[PDB]
Design a binder for this molecule. Structure first.
Ligand code: NA
Ligand code: NA
Ligand code: NA
Ligand code: NA
Ligand SMILES: [Y+3]
Ligand SMILES: [Y+3]
Lengths: 397, 393, 397, 393
């Protein structure tokens, strides 16, 4: 009741949030200020918070910035207005937060997730505002809810690095219905996909090649060309055969080698990523890749180091849950279409990891997409759609 | 003074300039303060000066820093004491000066060359200034013309080409490049150094079309793979029958991000040859290798000259004259023609080649290793003063 | 009526045919004897024949053997028992035959196709016997037919070379319902696929690299390494990026370069093939390939020659026709399943070219597959199924 | 006769053997008829013979033809007149013979070497037979031992290794390889040929897993791509500071069919070096290159030795002795030590190295260009007969 009204009594806050978080955008694992601000507000609304290491498994964190970068980002946050009461809980690259609202009334646990990080050289993640927005709506109308509602603010989504660490921490082991959201720019403004399935499994990794000269003196017979080794690696990688079961990808997006024009290269670096339509296919591609870089290093009798930088799996939304999401989304104002599933360029999202987990444990889950192409108020329709998903839940059945 | 006295009454000023230029060292193409000081001093001695653009052809410059870097250095040089009267002539990466002493009497045009730059991340200039002082003091005992070339960007063999293209050595009869040899015995003086291989240094920028690695791989045009294939092709270039040659892809940088098809790729390459012809063969092969690799991926490519130098073939008659004079010079132990040593490069060779090509004589002198400077000035001064105005060479 | 009986009164002939044609197997474009034998028998049954150049467009013949090979194969056929009355009509690599049965009774034209060639170094094509088999059944029961029935015996199916030449000759420009058959070894014995859609479009081509020394004397500076050029080509080819619209393939199956160990290679040969799930995708792959071989040749300043060796398109069976085929196949004895469409390893078949043609002109078509895996009498079930397809045609509707 | 007469009374037989061996020429490892004839003749002269397996280590043979080819040639040799008494000792690719003449008196062991094979798609044997005749006729004027090595597969440098491994030259004090030089002046005689680079010839077979190109590309393991990448790596092998070296992938064959992922690939490679050490460096690098390329595709690889030879360092004292004798030989114009010429290979070098390694002297003699044979026999005969039984070398 009066949800439509209350919403217009919140919109002015959300835009303020999208902008402030756009103003002080932070990269993967360095979302210190953002998490501090989110925690602050969420605690202010009376949510039971869980922070940092309690929700982010230290070990499974891939592609973390160096010890130095984590430090300045932390300090800059403290010098950026980040609340003192919370900031400390995220030091060391553990900027993450899960808010819990327990109604006391027996019932299922509904989880909604949004990422907080921006991109490195931040148009891509206005999702944090929608997360706070939904939190508010969920308090005012708390009385009509049952079971438990969980709000997940995930770090390092770019590069698919954060989800795994939150899953390893057990953040979604007690979730019955999972829903990840996204402001799809490549999606028609006014349209809403309730079953994002265009996500490929993937593996991110860097390869370091070292070719220490066999002896000093700089004699050509002692050189071990790391550059040529990575060059042959790059070719091998891209030559990996496709798979019969579905689409697959491989991309050496970055390569750095050498120190000087006249100097025989002894060091080289490759930034790679593999992808497959299914978990198995991507696993296949990654297996070959390792054989390719290993042999390439051997050719030049050079050494190599493999560094796992991130990973995600394939998405298979729960049919029933997507139906429910479609049914609710149709009534929402700005929603012109429900689509269910769409045909768009394939990509990857670590939210899939949380979905896979919830699904293996009996729950259901899906990835919602809100169109905006050809419109920064799409947050209101996202908020109402999500809020509606909870309030309208068929508690009995 | 009579000469020996003059040199001892000059030695102080010489270390003063050395200390100064060392303290205020400047990288290739950024020798603004040095060039200014040199010009101020030479003008004072009464030398006619050709500066900057008049002695450095713009288009022939290689491995030039970007505008921002040129401007910062120019401003820094002003703030470090560069004589404001001369500073403007070098603005834009044209720190170069040719000082001329025309005796007025008929005779040959003798040229001496020193470089002014230092390494990135040459006590030669002082020597050049000292020699300028002595030659003025004894202009009466000279004939013909005396030319002093102060060259920029010798490191990376980047500056000599532009001076040659400006005509700097086209009127030269006898040329002598001066260098302080660290890898040469404390008392030795090589008068015909030729341990220089011809070379070409260049960059290759490959430009393709970026695309999302997972979403639309068909829209991509991989510049990275083009560079990789070029790199392999470059190192497979066949040797040459006439002598040693080498190709090296020292640096490769490519790509924007892990999930984006690389649309930009850069190769820093170096070509070497025992002779000019051999180096030209290798470089030619290299151009075909990179054009093809770019075409393989439908990528565009741009080849940027970063450096160049040729082989050194010292004029025997001129070498002999220099050796004879050097021998008599006090602090000298061994006045040799050439001396064994690992091969390297030096663009002074372009001036030599040019001079020899027009009928003149040329050589490269090396003073081993400071007091090497007094010896170098006295020696070079002898070379000029004891010239066979009549008999010749 | 008594079709089931008549069939058992023909089986002894078919096995005799499969074996004789297995005995004297001929490769692509050299099916001289086979065509002579087929024509002979078909003429004996009273079919209106069209042979050689009248059914095989000379120009569009790809991957033809050399002038010499065509000669001996021809003579060996004459010395192999090939009928004299017909053999001459196939000289020069035009071994093909289309038999026509016109009932005078107005009606649609039904076409059935089978290939005759074996494979080169012949278990793969017992399809010619089934073709003759069906011809017989179609005569005896001629009275119950209407319109026109056409039987197509295609050469050079292996390597996808013959179909194009028959299409260019107009062989299927007047066909209303087209059906290509195949003894699917990779298909369950007793099963019949009425809608083969597992076929990818493809392009076959050889690349010849020439690197004539710039000068005599054998000086290394004059060499132009064709081997290294093809080597880099091979890598480039296999590195061609996949396509978002569907699966694609590239394979450099053969490479020959050099004349002697110590001699700098001046010549090289590549045997390649591209593939795509759709016509467009394969076209995309072939476009890249040409850029790859051209640039590779340039790197070593070598020359190159592209030779088109064959091609096929994607298969999209006519839904309605597949339904009809399924309905008829179900009643046939040896048929346990109808399936309609199956999931098997992708391949290529030039019969697709005839299908595409017939479909663009208003007719319908499909590719039938008869299982046999885990059974050399599958010809009887194929014959009856095909014969039934004709006899049962809904002439009225 | 006294010698000069003997040679003129022998010349006929010599052309008879030359004409015969030319007419019945045989390829490497297939010298069955030749070896038989040689053995029959030498046995007749009273020479002790070590044949086949006793002088050719089986495992050390390189570039051996397949069984079928060995058998066909063996049978063909029988049908062409090979003396049936000796033919069996060479069955299986062991056509080799070492003839020994032990004077019984104390002295040095002198060895002379000739090859018997011809090219595929050596009038040396006759020379060897003639020298055997003369030395027997004058055994009385000889001391110590005389050994005559008739070597198989000299083409492609394939046979010498197996003889060295059999111990054939371990008891040799003075070794001399004989060769007819077509690229040498009609009257010149090089006594210390050393225009031979060390070398290694080998094949690399890459074995992967075949699969249908379109149906199941993931089941494939491309041996073709492995060879391609190896080929590129092989031609990128860095040079060596101490001297010239070269790598060449002369042949590449791979694949079964257009629509099948290649599971078989073959590279025929050649490695060269100015010295033994330099060739070993290149070959070592080459082994790493091919093992890695095989690993890149999870393919197996097999490296087969097809040939090998080392550098030639003729013993100066022995060269001088040969030159002195050759000079006096009638039909000789120029008895030189070495002579400029393009570099090639010759496995005789393995016997030289071995001999020199055990304290003996060795050299390679070349007779320029037929009547070269009479001169070669007379010369070689002098070398043996005029030996400094006392004074020495
Ligand atoms: Na994001
Ligand atoms: Na310098
Ligand atoms: Na077939
Ligand atoms: Na030979
Ligand atoms: Y309302
Ligand atoms: Y019946």
């Amino acid at each position: 009741l009066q949800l439509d009204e209350y919403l217009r009594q919140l919109a002015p806050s959300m835009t303020q949030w999208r902008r402030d978080f756009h103003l002080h955008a932070e990269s993967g694992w360095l979302e210190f200020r953002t998490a501090s601000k989110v925690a602050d507000i969420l605690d202010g609304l009376g949510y039971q918070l869980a922070l940092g290491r309690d929700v982010i498994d230290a070990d499974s964190r891939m592609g973390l910035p160096d010890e130095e970068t984590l430090a300045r980002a932390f300090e800059r946050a403290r010098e950026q207005g980040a609340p003192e009461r919370w900031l400390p809980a995220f030091e060391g690259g553990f900027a993450g937060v899960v808010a819990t609202l327990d109604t006391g009334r027996p019932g299922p646990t509904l989880a909604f997730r949004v990422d907080m990080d921006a991109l490195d050289l931040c148009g891509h993640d206005g999702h944090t505002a929608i997360g706070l927005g939904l939190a508010h709506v969920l308090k005012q109308y708390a009385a009509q809810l049952n079971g438990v509602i969980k709000l997940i603010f995930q770090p390092a989504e770019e590069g698919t690095r954060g989800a795994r660490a939150m899953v390893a921490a057990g953040v979604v082991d007690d979730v019955d219905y999972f829903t990840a959201i996204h402001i799809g720019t490549g999606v028609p403004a006014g349209t809403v996909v309730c079953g994002g399935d265009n996500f490929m499994a993937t593996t991110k990794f860097d390869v370091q090649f070292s070719g220490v000269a066999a002896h000093a003196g700089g004699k050509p017979e002692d050189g071990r060309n790391a550059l040529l080794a990575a060059a042959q690696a790059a070719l091998g990688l891209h030559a990996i055969p496709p798979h019969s079961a579905g689409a697959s990808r491989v991309n050496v997006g970055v390569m750095q080698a050498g120190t000087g024009r006249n100097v025989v290269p002894s060091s080289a670096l490759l930034k790679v990523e593999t992808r497959g339509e299914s978990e198995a296919i991507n696993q296949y591609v990654f297996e070959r890749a390792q054989h390719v870089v290993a042999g390439a290093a051997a050719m030049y009798e050079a050494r190599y180091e493999l560094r796992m930088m991130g990973a995600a799996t394939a998405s298979a939304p729960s049919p029933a849950w997507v139906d429910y999401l479609r049914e609710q989304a149709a009534r929402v104002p700005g929603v012109q279409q429900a689509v269910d599933r769409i045909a768009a360029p394939a990509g990857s999202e670590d939210a899939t990891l949380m979905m896979a987990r919830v699904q293996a444990r009996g729950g259901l889950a899906s990835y919602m997409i809100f169109g905006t192409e050809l419109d920064e108020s799409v947050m209101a329709v996202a908020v109402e759609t999500l809020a509606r998903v909870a309030l309208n839940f068929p508690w009995q059945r």
